[PDB]
Amino acid sequence: NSNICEVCNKWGRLFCCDTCPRSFHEHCHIPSVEANKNPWSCIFCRIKTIQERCPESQSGHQESEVLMRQMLPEEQLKCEFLLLKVYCDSKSCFFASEPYYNREGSQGPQKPMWLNKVKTSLNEQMYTRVEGFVQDMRLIFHNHKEFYREDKFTRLGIQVQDIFEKNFRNIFAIQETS
Ligand SMILES: [Zn+2]
Ligand SMILES: [Zn+2]
Ligand SMILES: [Zn+2]
């Protein structure tokens, strides 16, 4: 197995996947690495299994259909994985913890949002449909863009949003378009 966490790329107290060479810190994996379970399979392996059990799941889908899906166990897992893929980018540090807003010429957002709050919301099964999760994720970046206006820091929001959206299209097999 790898000697660094797949998500944060640091060594430390790592838990190793039994079905692929990835390793994780306990709270870097989503959901948090399970207490017992031998063998243990990580979220990458669990997602690959879903795909392999239902090859047709990789045919293209309409986003509108995906968003209306109820958060049954497979959709819950897919949102957990998509959240993890965003944490895998180092620029996610800007969006992880609760933000605050005091900048001359801007007003903070009406509904602040951040990745750790989404992580808790998923853990506590607060989303009933995929739409709930996706709206909160997208709000993170939209708030950032709106607040930082013309400061070049706005680009961090564009960059992390692009990582989100590419992984959303991949994980939920959204029909390719120009
Ligand atoms: Zn880690
Ligand atoms: Zn694995
Ligand atoms: Zn089948």
Q: How is domain 60-178 classified at the CATH fold level?
A: Histone Acetyltransferase; Chain A (1.20.920)
Q: Retrieve residue 86's tokens.
A: 């965003």
CA of 164 to the centre of ligand 3 (A): 28
- Nearest-ligand number for the alpha carbon of 47: 2
- Maximum distance among all alpha carbons in the chain? 55
CATH 3.30.40.10 fits 1-59, yes or no: yes
- Nearest-ligand number for the alpha carbon of 57: 3
CA of 1 to the centre of ligand 2 (A): 10
- Nearest-ligand number for the alpha carbon of 39: 2
What's the rounded Cα separation, in Å, for the pair 135 and 17? 31
CA of 178 to the centre of ligand 3 (A): 29
Query: What's the reported resolution, in angstroms, to a tenth?
Result: 1.9
CA of 108 to the centre of ligand 3 (A): 48
Domain ranges of the chain: 1-59, 60-178
